Ligand binder design. Structure first.
Ligand SMILES: COc1cc(O)cc(Nc2ccc(C(=O)Nc3ccc4c(c3)C[NH2+]CC4)cc2)c1
Ligand SMILES: COc1cc(O)cc(Nc2ccc(C(=O)Nc3ccc4c(c3)C[NH2+]CC4)cc2)c1
Lengths: 316, 323
């Protein structure tokens, strides 16, 4: 047997680890009924436990095309499992460091996905508080997914906002980190960087940085607005979404609004579930809208993704 | 880029495999030798109370050199980053092997268990106890050999003062030696041959009670040789548990091999392989005498990195050459 893995292994076929981290691990798996690939964050529950519990609560309320999806939560004797969206494309961090620097046009394709995700987070009354390129992953279609909501509220020093260091705690800090991200994408180096943490802090607080020769005046202007030391003088989310730089080859503002619904349900997905549970229709729809994040939330959301990639609405 | 400036002179960085907590493991390639490595990236200002678990592990690994222990090559430290350059183990956990199949035969378990015994007898000979033996902590290299990993809960039982999975934990360790490691090897032995733990429950309080009472199922498929080794290793009193010396040449261990476990290291601290020192002398452009004197330091810098990977490359049947 194994009593920690009995409930899990009714629903998932467990694959390669590709995980390690003292308390937390990540294992590849396959959802048995849909055939669909997932990633499982297996926890050794025993410590840092109600910061796993805040992440789960945030993710249960956040549903978005640029936020990596939670399907299922399972809890045993010495485990918490989190069944999550499959992101084989790697970190955004892995792209920056392996190559030199993206073009303005290349950075815009990527940055508009970061803005869409973060504007949705803030609309839900949350702040991520750990925005960095390690925390943005690519799916199998090369689209960005915001991960790790472990520091979220209703991080890395180089990305940290002056007021966050200098003793005030909320979503103005996220705009700053997006400005650090913007700079690294286009330059290939951080705007504030030092050999000692005490000299890094001093540079952030002062707020002076290099303006490379290759940067356009449009790029220089967005950077100055986002990298304001006073969080009151930093660009608002509303003005970011439709900024001239943001729309500079796209003749339209960032679509930050979710295409992943909580309150409207796919009929092909409800009929194909009514076949398995042998319910009527009203019974199946009423059960799904509970969003308990059990096997039913898992099967439905992995059915919704199955039709999206062309394949039929079919359970095995 | 300033955290990765020194690292990226020596290593080409590839796919991320761990992320868990403060620690991310990244695959990489050592530029000069061409040899594949794994890099443990510690966030220094995230760590906190679990930062002593890092410095003690490094110090233990600097002193442990064996064929059944995952080798440390290089330690690098920046503004907020500790790096640990480690041996490449693409075969997966021993955990992954166990859960995938039914339950390994007595003969299958012996091939594997003799590699665990070699590894742990060497640890104890160096005055350490691992304290976190479990199948998640044993990896396969590209040649299907087990390597012992994660020395974070490391001991020195009769040295100066500074736990693990509950199911593997020795009775005396719950209530508060290297006698505990022999118990955990006995839990490992049981799971390999049975496919289930000898003590298992839904609640931790009911697991502890089962460990302390020390009673367990003896499956019908288990040989009387297997039943005998198990009761010797799974003694509640750590004084009545089988010693390492008696384990090394136990009748169960020696079945089909007809020689005891060779636990002694084939990886030396003193003898400096000839071809490696001559290959390094031509690259650095100095004599064999002060190349040898510089290697002799074991600082765990780029020179330990290149030398120990050169020694690895030779053993693999490959040319002793840097680019
Ligand atoms: C909300 O999203 C979260 C929250 C959290 O706490 C952690 C994660 N972490 C993930 C990490 C990795 C993956 C993932 O799918 N990675 C993946 C999948 C396949 C392959 C690789 C990585 C790399 N080798 C090729 C195959 C998914 C979530 C998310
Ligand atoms: C003493 O050794 C240690 C100490 C420690 O604190 C952690 C580790 N962890 C490791 C984890 C993984 C690997 C490793 O090499 N795994 C690996 C390498 C390549 C591939 C895989 C895993 C699986 N995907 C295909 C390719 C090595 C050490 C060790």
């Amino acid at each position: 047997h194994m009593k920690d893995y009995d409930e899990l292994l009714k629903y998932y076929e467990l694959h390669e680890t590709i995980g390690t981290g003292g308390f937390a691990k990540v294992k590849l798996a396959c959802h048995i009924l849909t055939g669909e690939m997932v990633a499982i964050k297996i926890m050794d529950k025993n410590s840092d436990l109600p910061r796993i519990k805040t992440e789960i609560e945030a993710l249960k309320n956040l549903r978005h095309q640029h936020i990596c999806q939670l399907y299922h939560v399972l809890e045993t004797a010495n485990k918490i499992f989190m069944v999550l969206e499959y992101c084989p494309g790697g970190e955004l961090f892995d792209y920056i460091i392996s190559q030199d620097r993206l073009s303005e046009e290349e950075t815009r394709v990527v940055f508009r996905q970061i803005v869409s995700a973060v504007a949705y987070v803030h609309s839900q009354g949350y702040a991520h508080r750990d925005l960095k390129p390690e925390n943005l992953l690519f799916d199998e279609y090369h689209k960005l997914k915001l991960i790790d909501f472990g520091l979220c509220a209703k991080g890395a020093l180089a990305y940290a906002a002056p007021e966050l260091i200098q003793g005030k705690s909320g979503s103005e800090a996220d705009v700053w980190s997006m400005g650090i991200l913007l700079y690294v994408l286009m330059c290939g180096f951080l705007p504030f960087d030092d050999d000692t943490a005490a000299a890094l802090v001093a540079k952030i607080m002062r707020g002076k940085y290099d303006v490379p020769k290759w940067l356009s005046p449009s790029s220089i202007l967005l950077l100055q607005q986002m990298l304001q030391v006073d969080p009151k003088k930093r660009i608002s989310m509303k003005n970011l979404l439709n900024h001239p730089w943001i729309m500079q080859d796209y003749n339209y503002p960032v679509e930050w609004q979710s295409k992943n619904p909580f309150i409207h349900l796919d009929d092909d997905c409800v009929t194909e579930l009514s076949v398995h549970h042998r319910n009527n229709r009203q019974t199946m729809e009423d059960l799904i809208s509970l969003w308990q994040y059990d096997h039913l939330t898992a099967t439905y959301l992995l059915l919704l993704a199955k039709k999206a990639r062309g394949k039929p609405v079919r359970l095995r």
